[PDB]
Design a protein around this ligand. Sequence first.
Ligand SMILES: *[C@@H]1O[C@H](CO)[C@@H](O[C@@H]2O[C@H](CO)[C@@H](O)[C@H](O)[C@H]2NC(C)=O)[C@H](O)[C@H]1NC(C)=O
Ligand SMILES: *[C@@H]1O[C@H](CO)[C@@H](O[C@@H]2O[C@H](CO)[C@@H](O)[C@H](O)[C@H]2NC(C)=O)[C@H](O)[C@H]1NC(C)=O
Ligand SMILES: *[C@@H]1O[C@H](CO)[C@@H](O[C@@H]2O[C@H](CO)[C@@H](O)[C@H](O)[C@H]2NC(C)=O)[C@H](O)[C@H]1NC(C)=O
Ligand SMILES: *[C@@H]1O[C@H](CO)[C@@H](O)[C@H](O)[C@H]1NC(C)=O
Ligand SMILES: *[C@@H]1O[C@H](CO)[C@@H](O)[C@H](O)[C@H]1NC(C)=O
Ligand SMILES: *[C@@H]1O[C@H](CO)[C@@H](O)[C@H](O)[C@H]1NC(C)=O
Lengths: 321, 321, 321, 160, 160, 160
Amino acid sequence: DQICIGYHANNSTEQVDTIMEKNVTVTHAQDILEKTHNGKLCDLDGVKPLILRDCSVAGWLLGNPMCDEFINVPEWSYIVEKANPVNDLCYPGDFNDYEELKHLLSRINHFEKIQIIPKSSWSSHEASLGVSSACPYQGKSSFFRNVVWLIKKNSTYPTIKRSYNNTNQEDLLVLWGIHHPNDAAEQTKLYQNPTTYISVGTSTLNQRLVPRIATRSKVNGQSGRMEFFWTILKPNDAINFESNGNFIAPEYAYKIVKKGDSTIMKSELEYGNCNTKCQTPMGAINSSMPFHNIHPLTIGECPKYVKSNRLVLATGLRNSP
Amino acid sequence: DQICIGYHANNSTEQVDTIMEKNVTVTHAQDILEKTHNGKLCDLDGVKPLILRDCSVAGWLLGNPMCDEFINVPEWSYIVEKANPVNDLCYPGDFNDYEELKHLLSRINHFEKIQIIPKSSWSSHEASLGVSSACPYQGKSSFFRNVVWLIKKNSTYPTIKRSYNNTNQEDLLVLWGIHHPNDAAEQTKLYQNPTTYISVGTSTLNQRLVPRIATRSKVNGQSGRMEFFWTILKPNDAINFESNGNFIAPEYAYKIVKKGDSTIMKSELEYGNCNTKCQTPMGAINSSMPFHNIHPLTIGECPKYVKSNRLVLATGLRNSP
Amino acid sequence: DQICIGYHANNSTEQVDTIMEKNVTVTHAQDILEKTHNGKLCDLDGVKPLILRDCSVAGWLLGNPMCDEFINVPEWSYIVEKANPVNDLCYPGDFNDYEELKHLLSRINHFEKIQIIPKSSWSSHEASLGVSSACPYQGKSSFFRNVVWLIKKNSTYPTIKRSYNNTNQEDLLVLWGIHHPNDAAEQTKLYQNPTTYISVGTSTLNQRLVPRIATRSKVNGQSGRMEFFWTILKPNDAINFESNGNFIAPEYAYKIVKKGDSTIMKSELEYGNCNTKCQTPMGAINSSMPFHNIHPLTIGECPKYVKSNRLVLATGLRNSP
Amino acid sequence: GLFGAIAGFIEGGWQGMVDGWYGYHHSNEQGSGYAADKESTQKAIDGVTNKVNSIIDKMNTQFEAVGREFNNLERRIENLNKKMEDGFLDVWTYNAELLVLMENERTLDFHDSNVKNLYDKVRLQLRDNAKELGNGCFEFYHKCDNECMESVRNGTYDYP
Amino acid sequence: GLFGAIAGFIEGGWQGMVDGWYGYHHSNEQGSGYAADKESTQKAIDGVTNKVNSIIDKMNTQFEAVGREFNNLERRIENLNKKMEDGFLDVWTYNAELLVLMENERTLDFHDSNVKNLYDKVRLQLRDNAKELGNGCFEFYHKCDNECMESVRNGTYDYP
Amino acid sequence: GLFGAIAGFIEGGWQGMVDGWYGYHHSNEQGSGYAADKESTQKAIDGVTNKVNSIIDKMNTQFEAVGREFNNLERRIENLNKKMEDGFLDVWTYNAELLVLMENERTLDFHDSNVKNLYDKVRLQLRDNAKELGNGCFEFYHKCDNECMESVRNGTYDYP
Ligand SMILES: *[C@@H]1O[C@H](CO)[C@@H](O[C@@H]2O[C@H](CO)[C@@H](O)[C@H](O)[C@H]2NC(C)=O)[C@H](O)[C@H]1NC(C)=O
Ligand SMILES: *[C@@H]1O[C@H](CO)[C@@H](O[C@@H]2O[C@H](CO)[C@@H](O)[C@H](O)[C@H]2NC(C)=O)[C@H](O)[C@H]1NC(C)=O
Ligand SMILES: *[C@@H]1O[C@H](CO)[C@@H](O[C@@H]2O[C@H](CO)[C@@H](O)[C@H](O)[C@H]2NC(C)=O)[C@H](O)[C@H]1NC(C)=O
Ligand SMILES: *[C@@H]1O[C@H](CO)[C@@H](O)[C@H](O)[C@H]1NC(C)=O
Ligand SMILES: *[C@@H]1O[C@H](CO)[C@@H](O)[C@H](O)[C@H]1NC(C)=O
Ligand SMILES: *[C@@H]1O[C@H](CO)[C@@H](O)[C@H](O)[C@H]1NC(C)=O
């Protein structure tokens, strides 16, 4: 008559690592790392992303005429942008402090756009003539839809003195530009006046832009440059423009709905018609796993990212053959 | 006749945590996390902080007339400043490289202020008329005390040409500014000359500033701006000002006694007349605990900060009931 | 008769540390920290570094004439520059975005110097009298070998227009510079024209520099200032220079051969005539240890820096006397 | 195994014991079989369930990367940004991996200890009524039917 | 606990032993009481203090926050700086809390194992002379007064 | 030492077993000497070597410092950069130092656990044929020559 102390075994083929032994078979393990995603871009709590497709953030905010899908877009959870969108600044140039802008954009879910300075309202200057073949729309020369390329009226450019006060209670993002022509005469052809400047004021803005006539690389068949600028106009405060040439006028501004909690991710991926509570640039995550190894960059209720290929816990004992 | 092997109990009610079990009563424990502070700003090894009250660093350095508490102040351990001090640049403007300057202040314990260009010293320009009702002292319009707002004399503003040689063995902080009027009339009314500049040179400095007559919102009833600059004057180097108007002249400068090791902290608290060895923005710490969870920013011999709410070690054994 | 269970001792004197006991003698230990180095700068896998000796990076690239040892240097593994190279900008001044260029140099192993604007080639400007006694070569006043300090020919500085097109498959580093005289006469003497500029352009560059006449300390007995700029020219893009004076034109530019993996390290050390696979600014590491404590900055096949003085593992057991 | 029992002096696990992690096989006159020890099983489950819960929690504070863009002439601070975010992932990955390596070892020794304890409990309790075979098993000197075997299983073997 | 002495084969602590961490209770004709074992207690105290001094030291290197200010259009490197500091704080917090969770466990097991060793010292010495009751206690067959009891305590039992 | 054998109930190592880590001493009528035990030794060598290889790998991701220059008016980011790189070195030095500390403790105990399991292995085997001397050694009652002594080492002692 015998009594024996012993312990569970079973057909588990499951293995865990230790410091002194690798690949130890256990009766019971817990794999705590997510390695699968769905490969799609999905809504985030039923709230679709701004998928800028071929349009760059700049090409959206200025209304590149090839970015008419994004004239006024609904609130978004995150924004998705390609590596190298072909529809950036149609007219070659520079967006000044672009990244510092993007940063704010990254903490913004909604823009409601509104008119600040009407295209009708330019008494003394023409502004339907500011169109470039470099910015085509539907065949015909065009330009950024939210700003206005004012040209001379009857060989005269009278000093502009226009002004806007912010009587919406949301911070207003305001965009303007200058044109640096390529030759001494282009200046004269377009605006008449030889030496020019654009001077921008707010409570905190003290700016005087001045054009930069220089000989440079044809790029999108263009030898001149737009050079765009922006500011946040606090609500109940006025911006004060003034120029005697080269002014790209604000026509539209963006009303901020600072909703908060967003990101611009980099994805050559199309929209995928799904929901998810966690999204990565590579696809969306669905697990209770404490961790995943999909992608460092995620938005939403997410596992912690690690660089491991494998993370598994013993729960049971060494499974003996 | 029995002999038994056993271990200590007691009435300890102290719990400690482990990986496998929480709330384990031990017979002895060592709480190692400090959770208390005095709630006050105190001296740091008998050396009182510069507590800027309602003045901001800028407001102190250029001597806002509302900031007279700090016209000359003794060596400091640390500086305390509020989140939104009311006494800043009274006459609206900017301070330039403000933060890079405040960074230096993080490594300085004592200034000593000395005259470099006396107010009397101006033969051909008036120096008592550059005052503004925005910078009032005692009800009377005044101005930043360490700089001189030079104004035109008998209706001419003759080119300025001044030069200072550092005949102290210290690095020297040197502060100057430029006025940006809001119309060409103010330009004429104040300085006569309509196309001005300021030039400044040291071994390393190569700057020619120039006013920006733009049109802007009233901030403290002012539509002008000052924009203050600064530099570090090596000993046996000379600074070389030159201007035909808009020039806010150095009257004063600060002699750096670079006693090293300091912080500008952000606290709405007043002086508390305590002394201490370790100080945070919420209060000061008196302990030997290796760690603390009061606030991440400290100055002096401090425990290590952690975000824990509780850090207790076993030393004794599981205490049975 | 006795059988006994027992264990190894020996004359091992090796001690290792634990949490609860320090200095525990063990029969066997494995020291895993590298404490030693050869104390020299050595080639890195047969490939000699560029040891700039007294020349600063700036001094090397513009070709300061005390830096002729480096007129065309071969592919290098790493660069060594001293803390305060005596031979920098001979003509006092500033190297614009210097640190951002030194960055690029970090990721570059070979430059090949080529002419892009011959010295002979300047028809309407004198290209040989741009020499200063601050930049001496063999007793005689010289100047930055890779750029040309153009001066007036017969009292006319005709507006410059030159253009270089990159037809190599490499990116090309183009260096130029502007000159800031100290007085009106100086300007007038050297260039004729009193209000001058240089306007530089490529597909991505939109520049217009303007001389900055002010009055400043004699550094190297020179009162003026050079201000050198730089760009990277894409292969098949063209930089389009234009000036009426103050121009320090290109003559040479460097073609990049970007073999990557290099640093600039800082070392008062000379060349050591040795090979290694792991180099620190202090000397090089010949070792198999996982870790070392020599210096944190290394290049090559390298053990991991830690700040420890000692890291010894127990392998054997507590060595009992 | 630190504690000598599992894959030690008990050479293998029991496929037959499907009811708990530690227990008994008794073999006598009326037949035989297995009976899991509920108490140690239930202590072991708890200890392991807290362990894992503790492993999930404490690794929840973790660094969350944030994308951030820098232009052609801001290389240094972008590279700062790179080396910094990569640095934290390496710290947290090192951390998570090494903790798993460590606590997996502690779990295996935990189970080993649980078995050694149970053995020692049974062994003392069988003072000198049985030949400790040295293989997990005790052979009685007297007959020990299902009423008696359960006596040991009970904790209340002890012929008072 | 791993070694099965504390709250294990020995159900509980002794409120009446105020003299040390582990030791003896004896009971015979002349009456009874406690006696703390000096050497095992003293090894426990040294082990435990060294650990606490070790725990304090290896942590003193830790990251120190430092105030840094950034203007309105320096938001990207402000966030960097913020993510950078919160980063090291989460890493040090984790480090410190966990080492405490880990070393706490190891301390308790240490005490468990100190009692177990002390039991075995006594268990051997008492060889064939006492019924190992199995609860911490040995019962002599041959009467054992204070000169004898102190014999075991002394570690110089043995009928040589 | 946790497992109570090394520097425990075995006072000290054997200067004369130059052949392995754990082993046997016999002393009988035909002479006396030492025999290293191959299995426990070889299990220990493997376990330790893995530990070392483990320690080296898992520490191989580790932060690499990259040199970076800044101008007179870039003091904040240079300092950011400095306290960033110093910061990782401190996290890695702690991680490395503590791992050595921790695992050294575990190594020593492993050897302890190994010597113990061997003593426990001999003690079951020798059943009741030998006085367990309390000191590492067992004294047989019946003459045990070299053929007998190898019956113990062997594993095939026990009179069948
Ligand atoms: C922008 O417009 C607003 C509202 O029209 C101005 O603020 C008002 O100005 C009056 C002037 O006496 C103040 O007393 C009130 O506080 C303001 N009204 C409201 C309803 O807020 C504002 O000042 C304008 N911006 C500037 C500075 O030109
Ligand atoms: C600032 O003044 C100091 C001393 O008053 C100048 O240094 C002297 O100038 C001469 C010029 O030939 C030097 O050779 C001497 O070495 C200096 N004398 C002493 C006592 O050190 C200094 O150069 C002045 N600043 C400048 C650069 O103009
Ligand atoms: C730099 O020179 C190159 C070649 O000399 C120019 O590229 C050529 O431009 C012609 C224009 O008719 C194109 O059709 C060719 O495709 C280009 N050549 C080849 C074979 O690559 C280049 O455009 C010049 N740079 C600029 C912007 O003017
Ligand atoms: C562990 O097991 C895996 C199979 O799951 C195998 O690929 C790997 O090589 C093993 N590692 C070692 C070193 O034993
Ligand atoms: C530990 O004890 C505290 C009471 O002091 C309690 O609030 C806490 O929830 C306990 N933790 C757990 C999970 O048992
Ligand atoms: C350990 O030993 C070294 C000598 O090698 C000694 O300097 C050091 O102080 C010792 N540490 C302690 C705390 O015993």
